[PDB]
Enzyme design. Structure first.
Site, PDB file in Angstrom:
ATOM      1  N   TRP A   1       0.836  -1.075  -0.082  1.00 35.11           N
ATOM      2  CA  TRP A   1       0.096  -0.083   0.032  1.00 35.11           C
ATOM      3  C   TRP A   1       1.020   1.326   0.086  1.00 35.11           C
ATOM      4  O   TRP A   1       0.648   2.430  -0.771  1.00 35.11           O
ATOM      5  CB  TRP A   1      -0.970  -0.016   1.200  1.00 35.11           C
ATOM      6  CG  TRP A   1      -1.684   1.312   1.084  1.00 35.11           C
ATOM      7  CD1 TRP A   1      -1.655   2.443   1.979  1.00 35.11           C
ATOM      8  CD2 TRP A   1      -2.808   1.599   0.184  1.00 35.11           C
ATOM      9  NE1 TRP A   1      -2.428   3.342   1.547  1.00 35.11           N
ATOM     10  CE2 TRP A   1      -3.316   2.723   0.368  1.00 35.11           C
ATOM     11  CE3 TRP A   1      -3.468   0.673  -0.861  1.00 35.11           C
ATOM     12  CZ2 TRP A   1      -3.887   3.479  -0.428  1.00 35.11           C
ATOM     13  CZ3 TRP A   1      -4.618   1.457  -1.619  1.00 35.11           C
ATOM     14  CH2 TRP A   1      -4.819   2.761  -1.329  1.00 35.11           C
TER      15      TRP A   1
ATOM     16  N   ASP B   1       6.852   6.174  -7.922  1.00 33.18           N
ATOM     17  CA  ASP B   1       7.871   6.093  -8.603  1.00 33.18           C
ATOM     18  C   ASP B   1       9.273   5.454  -8.197  1.00 33.18           C
ATOM     19  O   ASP B   1       9.149   4.801  -6.933  1.00 33.18           O
ATOM     20  CB  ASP B   1       8.438   7.523  -9.031  1.00 33.18           C
ATOM     21  CG  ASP B   1       8.745   8.223  -8.022  1.00 33.18           C
ATOM     22  OD1 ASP B   1       8.879   7.961  -6.633  1.00 33.18           O
ATOM     23  OD2 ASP B   1       8.597   9.526  -8.162  1.00 33.18           O
TER      24      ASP B   1
ATOM     25  N   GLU C   1       9.814   6.348  -4.496  1.00 33.57           N
ATOM     26  CA  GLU C   1       8.579   5.958  -3.308  1.00 33.57           C
ATOM     27  C   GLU C   1       7.564   7.191  -3.566  1.00 33.57           C
ATOM     28  O   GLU C   1       7.094   7.497  -2.090  1.00 33.57           O
ATOM     29  CB  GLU C   1       9.174   5.617  -2.220  1.00 33.57           C
ATOM     30  CG  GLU C   1       8.232   4.544  -1.408  1.00 33.57           C
ATOM     31  CD  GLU C   1       9.164   3.888  -0.181  1.00 33.57           C
ATOM     32  OE1 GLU C   1      10.052   3.173  -0.510  1.00 33.57           O
ATOM     33  OE2 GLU C   1       8.977   4.431   0.908  1.00 33.57           O
TER      34      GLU C   1
ATOM     35  N   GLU D   1      25.099   7.130  -1.169  1.00 30.39           N
ATOM     36  CA  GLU D   1      24.086   7.396  -1.872  1.00 30.39           C
ATOM     37  C   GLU D   1      24.051   8.486  -2.686  1.00 30.39           C
ATOM     38  O   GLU D   1      23.615   8.729  -3.866  1.00 30.39           O
ATOM     39  CB  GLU D   1      22.779   7.147  -1.080  1.00 30.39           C
ATOM     40  CG  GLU D   1      21.423   7.519  -1.782  1.00 30.39           C
ATOM     41  CD  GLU D   1      20.470   7.450  -0.602  1.00 30.39           C
ATOM     42  OE1 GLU D   1      20.295   8.471   0.233  1.00 30.39           O
ATOM     43  OE2 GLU D   1      19.726   6.528  -0.337  1.00 30.39           O
TER      44      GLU D   1
END
EC number: 3.2.1.205
Length: 371
Positions: free
Chosen positions: A117, A167, A170, A327
């Site tokens: 969800w 996407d 998120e 990241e």
């Protein structure tokens, strides 16, 4: 284009990239996203893992990449019944909710790691198809090893490619994201043009659905000559070059490819470090290693070797003292006032991010620079 000083450093970062990915690969074969980042640790993503696997396959570690594909295949075969039930629900006119869909996060033992969800995404399944086919072709491997898991992924994507979902980042579950569509397309074309898969029942369907994806992108995913972040938007996202290489909505020499690279460079690339999207507040919206690598890969494939190298150099400059790649980095922030709260809540930025290393390996290989 590189002196001995640069070559030595780039070679070492490639060696270290291989080492860090294979050191952290789970016993069962999954690649984790980030072993020490609070919000990611303990989970695997097909997106991160597929690009990681492609870097490892290019590097030549057939064993490690194979174990990842084994892991994914087995995880997907375990979902054969779940997928068959979803498809039967569709056929009865009872379209499943996002809450019933296949997951985004996986635990290393192949269970749902999160509730779809809140994070429903279809891209990773497309990426995996691309990845496994590409690996098998590169190394001369028999896809029957992974075929039953391929069949689950194909069936799922043929049914659900056109559904709105979150996407890669998120966000925006109500939209249809062009780099998600692109990932699916890449996977479908990979299997639909694979001679080993010529007799699969879904063979023709994969190419027909890929064509439907391209139709949808042509109709609603191109503005002012460039791809856009989601159907019906005007803006770009840093993921969009993936739609060119590797996922193949258009070839590198297409005008839409050129315009998309230029739009991403202009709107999102600061000094070689590529942002995700204009509104990004995550850690203040920093510069993402994987996205600089993706753009560099795309530039190399278009013949812009200098531009590719500039982005490779920028990535290399972000490696820490141990050679680990974060990241993202905050040299330029889209929304600087939002960074502190992320650090305070979740800790310092994910480092290493395995996907950063994977992308580094891909770009290095594209430029002929693997040791």
């Amino acid at each position: 284009g590189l002196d001995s000083h640069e070559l030595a450093r780039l070679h070492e970062l490639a060696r270290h990239s291989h080492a860090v990915i294979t050191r952290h690969q789970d016993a069962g074969g999954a690649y984790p996203a980030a072993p020490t980042f609070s919000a990611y640790r303990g989970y695997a993503w097909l997106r991160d893992g597929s690009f990681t696997a492609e870097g490892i396959s290019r590097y030549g570690d057939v064993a490690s990449a194979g174990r990842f594909h084994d892991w994914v295949d087995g995880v997907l075969r375990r979902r054969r019944g779940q997928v068959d039930d979803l498809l039967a629900a569709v056929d009865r006119g009872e379209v499943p909710s996002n809450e019933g869909m296949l997951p985004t996060r996986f635990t290393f033992d192949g269970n749902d790691g999160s509730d779809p969800w809140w994070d429903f995404q279809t891209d990773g399944y497309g990426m995996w198809l691309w990845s496994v086919v590409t690996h098998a072709a590169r190394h001369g491997l028999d896809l029957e090893r992974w075929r039953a898991g391929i069949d689950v992924a194909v069936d799922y994507l043929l049914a659900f490619w056109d559904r709105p979902c979150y996407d890669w980042w998120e966000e925006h579950v109500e939209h249809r994201h062009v780099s998600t569509l692109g990932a699916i397309h890449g996977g479908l074309v990979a299997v639909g043009t694979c001679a080993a898969l010529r007799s699969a029942p879904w063979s023709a369907a994969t190419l027909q659905v890929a064509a439907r994806i391209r139709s949808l992108v042509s109709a609603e995913g191109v503005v002012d000559g460039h791809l856009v972040k989601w159907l019906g938007s005007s803006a770009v996202d840093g993921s969009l070059p993936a739609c060119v290489v590797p996922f193949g909505l258009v070839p590198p020499d297409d005008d839409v490819a050129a315009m998309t690279r230029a739009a991403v460079a202009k709107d999102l690339d600061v000094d070689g470090g590529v942002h995700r999207f204009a509104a990004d507040v995550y850690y203040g919206g920093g510069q993402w290693i994987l996205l600089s690598a993706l753009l560099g890969w795309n530039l190399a494939a278009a013949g812009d070797t200098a531009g590719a190298l500039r982005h490779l150099r920028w990535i290399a400059d972000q490696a820490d003292a141990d050679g680990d790649l974060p990241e993202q980095v905050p040299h330029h922030l889209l929304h600087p006032g939002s960074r502190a709260e992320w650090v305070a809540r979740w800790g310092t930025v994910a480092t290493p991010l395995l996907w950063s290393h994977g992308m580094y390996l891909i770009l290095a290989d594209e430029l002929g620079l693997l040791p």
